[PDB]
Amino acid sequence: LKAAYIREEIQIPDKVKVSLENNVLKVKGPKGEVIKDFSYAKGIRIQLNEGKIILETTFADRRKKALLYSIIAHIKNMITGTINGYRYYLKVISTHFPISVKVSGDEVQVSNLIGEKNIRRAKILPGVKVTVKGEDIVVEGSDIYNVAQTAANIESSTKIVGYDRRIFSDGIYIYKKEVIG
Amino acid sequence: RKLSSPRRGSAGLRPRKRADEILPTPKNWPLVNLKEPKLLGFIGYKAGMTHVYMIDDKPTSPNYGKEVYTPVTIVESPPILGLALRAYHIDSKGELSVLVDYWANFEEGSLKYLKRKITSLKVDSSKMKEKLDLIQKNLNNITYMRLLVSTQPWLVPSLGKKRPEIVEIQIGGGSIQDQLNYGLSLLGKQIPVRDVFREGQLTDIIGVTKGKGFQGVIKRYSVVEFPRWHKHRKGSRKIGARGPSISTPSYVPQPGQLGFHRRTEYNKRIIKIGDNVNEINPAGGIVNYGLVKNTYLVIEGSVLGSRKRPLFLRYPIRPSWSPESAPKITYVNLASQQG
Amino acid sequence: MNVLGSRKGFTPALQHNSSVVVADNSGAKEAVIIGIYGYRGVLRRVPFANIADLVMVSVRKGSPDVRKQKFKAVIVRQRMPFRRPDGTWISFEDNAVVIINPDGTPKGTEVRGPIAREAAERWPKIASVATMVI
Amino acid sequence: VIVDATNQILGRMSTHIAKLLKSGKKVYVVNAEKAIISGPRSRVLEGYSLLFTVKTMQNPYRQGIRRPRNPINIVKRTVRGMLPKNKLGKQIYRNLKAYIGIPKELEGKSMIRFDDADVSRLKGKYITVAELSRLLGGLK
Amino acid sequence: MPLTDPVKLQIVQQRVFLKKICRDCGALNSIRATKCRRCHSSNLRAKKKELPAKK
RNA sequence: GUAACCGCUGAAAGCAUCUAAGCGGGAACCCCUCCCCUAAAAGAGGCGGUCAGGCGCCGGGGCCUUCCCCUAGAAGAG
RNA sequence: UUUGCUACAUCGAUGUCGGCUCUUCCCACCCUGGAGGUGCAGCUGCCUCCAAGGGUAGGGCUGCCCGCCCGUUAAAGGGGAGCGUGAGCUGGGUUUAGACCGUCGCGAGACAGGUCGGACUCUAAGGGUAGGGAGUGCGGACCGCUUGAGGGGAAGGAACCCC
RNA sequence: CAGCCUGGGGCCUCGUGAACGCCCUGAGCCGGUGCACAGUCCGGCAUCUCCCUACACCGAGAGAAGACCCCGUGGAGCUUCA
RNA sequence: AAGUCCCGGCUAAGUGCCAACGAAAAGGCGUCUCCAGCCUUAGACAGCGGGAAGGUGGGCCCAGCAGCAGCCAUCCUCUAAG
């Protein structure tokens, strides 16, 4: 096929101001505000309506229409964080040695694993808050991508269990995400 | 059938040629490492060597806290007489040439030692004022700041020479403005090795190795004598083949000069900086050198180069371990190197 | 077996097909170095051995029941000049070994002549029946 | 005669240089690091990385030797290897100069662009020249 | 596996229903994906979990 | 900076989807830091100083050989 | 990579097996690195993929290659470069002339069956290569010090032990 | 698993004083083409000139109408039941 | 030596930029166009909760197989549903 003229709209929620210029988008919300660039949307024109988001394009291919909807999802996700908080959950299960984790500024450190004395670390993207209560790690923030990549960075660090041992289900693992608050 | 064999000789240093200045120079510098203005190397001379007795300082030594025996080299450390300050900056074409020099011995230094080798400045235009403030005008846009210093071998009868070498050292430290002032002070005076070094430091060595003359391939690249029968047949001290074809008669062991090279040395930790010549001088006058009569550097291991060569020293480029000071000693060999 | 992580090894001493005496009561008297455990070499370099090395030899002169047989031992005596860590130089008037059982203990029950200190740590079972140590 | 290569396609921008070369008039190029090559990062490096022999670098730019890795090295081989192989081809190559940024004494003179070399003529997936030396070995 | 996901049916949270692997390229794929992510061979077999109790 | 690959945000194709764009890691792999020869690099560099004084001339100033040796070596060189 | 055919090139010669030394390449990876699956409790396994940077021995029998085996090691990978290399070598195999032995022949003798000895030439015109030196230009003579395009690298690699 | 020293060569200097390879002086290297392995051809890479010494890797180096295989209604020799 | 010539469309590998010459079977919904067949506004697919069922878990041998231990049938309580 060939999508002739596909148009979609995004109703901007209240208590939000939106600024757009130079094909660079920034969204401000009570939870927070993040700037997300969209200079890479060749073949897509972006119209910032005073009360909504106007997205139009003419004669997109199979590639572009996936791209357009792909652009759409992030923007509302950009909106969603600015109103409702993103709360990933990381549950830790250990077999023989209890696991301890502490925060170091923009870096995370985990040790007391299955017997190795070394240190393990992961990187946290700026502007992202992550804390621990107990048996669980709370990852806060507005940007959805920022927490997940941060959350994933922990997941990579704790993966080291996987060499020549059948996996012992031991380490740091994702639990759930996105409480309404 | 074509068994495994490491390529013999050392392909790493081609070309192998003889240096063009008896006193080499470093081409990089280890980072300043978060500190204040001071120099990062020193000059000296290869006087001799002996063996010394110490308690091990390496906290992870298998020989920690015990007396073990180790050969040690002595380096007489005559005072250094600075000459000038050199300005390096990102010039046109984005390079790091010399912006300007800053010479001053008309204010102090009525010494013709320098005159023996350079027909240096007269008092007619000792107007470095417009030169010096040029640095001040060009302040904040400067990258590196070396130093012009000369040796004073005339204070060492061991080396029968009187025209000296003037060479360079780059200085790192705190802020740039500080460093220029730090250097400014050092001009026109004398500087001991203690002004740059302290015992228990690491130090790097770049210098000229013991020359040997034209050599044989057996010796140059440690190529192998052909087995038995060639000790009787057609010739013995040569490589058989010289490449699969004229497709690059290649980097293969071929004769040539060996020695007198610009080389390298890593991980050298000093032992003692003493000042009593009687504590170190061996029996009957040190071999081929004389009688050390200035401050000396007590360096273990081996140091490249022939006796009576100037040597230029340097802070560690990739130090293996951070050393503490004063690996205290227990014996010095004053026995004759002869006998 | 227990100390080789320290300065296990010194100046080159011996080679394959090198003949040494059997300094014990096992019944063997003369043996020839047949091989070297552990060591890995390069082109044409004959494999090495000195004091305190798992070494492999065979019986040349001794009791018939042990003649032409294979057994393991350790090197205890060498003629080589070499430098101890404290900077002394040790030598033995000849070259001797003591046959050891495959588990590690010496096969023999008696020791002949002095042994350098080093072997004792690498083979405490040798030190168990060691008489004098130098 | 001065030409800017900012936001220009090196291969495309190369061409009209050559006719100016064959003309017999001295030329210059400024801000050369601001040209681009179409293609993703992997290929464009790989399509250049294959030529490497060894690594280091120890002079001011002036040599022009068998392997280019300075920002204004790459422009030369691309402009040189596109010149007559006869004797004048060498001689015309003598009349070209390369630069990074803007030489001071050429600021107050005109510059021209080659419209055919505009980035707009290309779909996308391009990389700037200066980015290359970062991966190519140019500290600058 | 020690590999989790943002919100899916990952094993470590009190289960072992591992992912799917490719018989051809030797890599892993999604649970319900019908073909490999790399060679698309579609002859993908589930990773064995364990012998829980008996036959 | 990368291979294989492991991830994340994610549509196509509502879900799902590590990939399509988008984003992160990820090797004895390629490069930069190390050392070695480099101003015959043709863009062929920069910086310090001297080459005087006097009436082409006087004059001297520089350099080399010669001289004595060796840190060095076939001479050359240094 | 061998081995079968082809006779396009070489018969006024491109001197033939192996081995020695020495250089380099390639990847269909022997080990070392990375990742994974497993009928992976852990070790040991088995297998896939990426990865050619480095390493990949020492002996006995056999002239070899091949092959059998010894004791260690990470294993003791396989191939190319005119089955790499004789104006660098050994002549052990093999291509002569002397003989013996076995089969065949009345005979001259033949054998692809075995065994003893049997000559291994060259002062590098030119290039490559490795050093060391003079000059011109870069620019009047100089003295001195420096900037630092490219060039090469393995300048390290491996194992064992302590906890 | 190599090392040191000595004599004569080899180094240099005075005197004497040749021969070999020569279509050439124009020959650097790498892919390619072609008699299926170039110095000239094609395409790149470079490549300042002069001199001395060491190396024989190449110059499909030189030495010799190949000692082998076959042809010529070519020789010689030997033998016999031609 | 002359076209950075035009229209339309496709390719992301430097695939390719090759007449005489240089990659098979298979795999790919990776992508780009085209034939069938079947459901779709009497509400399509997908997606989201419930009813998602009962004599009966019928059952045969079978401790029990209470669809899914070895063969297999099979009616209404029923209706916008089993």
Q: What is the DSSP string of B236-248?
A: SSS-S---SSSS-
DSSP sequence for B63-110: TBTSEEEEEEEEEE---EEEEEEEEEE--GGG---EEEEEE--SSS--
Q: Technique behind this structure? A: cryo-EM
Chain A hits for E6, CB-CB cut-off 8 Å, are: 88, 148, 151, 174, 177
Q: From CA B89, how far away is CA A9, in angstroms rounded? A: 57
Crossing angle of helices D129-136/D41-49, nearest 10°?
A: 60
Q: Which residues pair with residue C32 across a beta bridge?
A: C19, C58
Q: Which nucleotides of F are covered by protein (CB under 7 A)?
A: 1-13, 16-25, 30-39, 41-50, 62-63, 71-74, 77-78
Q: Nearest-CA neighbor of A153 among A122, A126, A180?
A: A122
Strands D28-30 and D2-4: parallel
- The DSSP H or E segment spanning A60 is strand A52-60
Record the tokens describing residue A63, joined without a space. 């590639």
Check if the beta carbon of residue A122 is closer than 8 Å to that of residue A107.
Answer: yes
Strands C96-100 and C19-22: parallel
Q: Kindly provide the resolution of this structure in angstroms, with one decimal.
A: 4.9
Check if the beta carbon of residue A83 is closer than 8 Å to that of residue A39.
Answer: no
Q: Which nucleotides of G are covered by protein (CB under 7 A)?
A: 18-24, 35-44, 48-49, 54-59, 65-66, 70-76, 79-82, 84-85, 88-90, 127-133, 143-155, 160-162
What is residue C21's three-state secondary structure?
strand
Chain D hits for B95, CB-CB cut-off 8 Å, are: 60
Q: From CA A44, how far away is CA A75, in angstroms rounded? A: 14
Contact with chain D for residue B14, Cβ under 8 A: no
Q: What is the DSSP letter of D105?
A: G
- The DSSP H or E segment spanning A151 is helix A144-157
Cis omega (within 30 of 0) on the bond before B15?
yes
Identify the sign of the CA torsion D31, D37, D41, D46.
negative
DSSP sequence for B121-177: --GGG--HHHHHHHHHHTTTSEEEE--EEE--GGG-TTS---S--EEE--EE-S-HH
What is residue A21's three-state secondary structure?
strand
Q: How far is the CA of C110 from the C1' of G102 (A)?
A: 64
Question: Cβ neighbours of residue C132 under 8 Å, at least 6 residues apart?
Answer: C113, C114, C115
User: Which whole-number Å values give the CA distances from E35 to B287, C122, E25, E31, in the listed order?
Assistant: 82, 60, 11, 10
Chain A hits for E4, CB-CB cut-off 8 Å, are: 155, 173-174
Q: From CA A147, how far away is CA E11, in angstroms rounded? A: 21
User: Which phi-psi region, left, alpha or beta, contains residue A90 (left: φ > 0; alpha: ψ -120 to 50)?
Assistant: beta
Record the tokens describing residue E45, joined without a space. 């077999």
Residues of B 205-224 whose CB lies less than 7 Å from any atom of strand H: 218-219, 224
Q: Which residues pair with residue C20 across a beta bridge?
A: C31
Question: Cβ neighbours of residue B2 under 8 Å, at least 6 residues apart?
Answer: none
Q: From CA C17, how far away is CA C32, in angstroms rounded? A: 6
Question: Cβ neighbours of residue A163 under 8 Å, at least 6 residues apart?
Answer: none
Q: Nearest-CA neighbor of A124 among A100, A88, A85, A93?
A: A88
Record the tokens describing residue D76, joined without a space. 């030369």
Q: How far is the CA of C78 from the C1' of G92 (A)?
A: 39
Contact with chain E for residue A12, Cβ under 8 A: no
Identify the sign of the CA torsion B311, B315, B317, B318.
positive
Nearest-CB residue to B68 (from C43, C44, C87) = C87
Q: Around Cβ E19, how many Cβ atoms within 10 Å?
A: 19
Q: Which residue has the tokens 């490491």?
A: B6
Torsions phi, psi for D128 (to 5 deg)? -70, 160
Check if the beta carbon of residue B187 is closer than 8 Å to that of residue B300.
Answer: no
Chain B hits for C42, CB-CB cut-off 8 Å, are: 6
Tell me whether residues B27 and D140 touch, CB distance under 8 A: no
Q: How far is the CA of B97 from the C1' of G35 (A)?
A: 49
Amino acid at C50: N
Q: Nearest-CA neighbor of B286 among B48, B75, B72, B44?
A: B48
DSSP sequence for D20-71: HHHHT---EEESGGG-EEES-HHHHHHHHHTT-------S-GGG--SS--SH
Kindly report the nearest CA distance between residue C89 and chain B, in angstroms: 12
Check if the beta carbon of residue B202 is closer than 8 Å to that of residue B316.
Answer: yes
- Residue C91 CB-density burial (10 A; 0-12 exposed, 13-18 middle, 19+ buried): exposed
- The DSSP H or E segment spanning B214 is strand B214-215
Torsions phi, psi for A61 (to 5 deg)? -90, -170
Q: From CA B122, how far away is CA B139, in angstroms rounded? A: 28
Residue C46 Cβ < 7 Å to strand H: yes
Q: How far is the CA of A48 from the C1' of I58 (A)?
A: 69
Q: From CA E48, how far away is CA E16, in angstroms rounded? A: 9
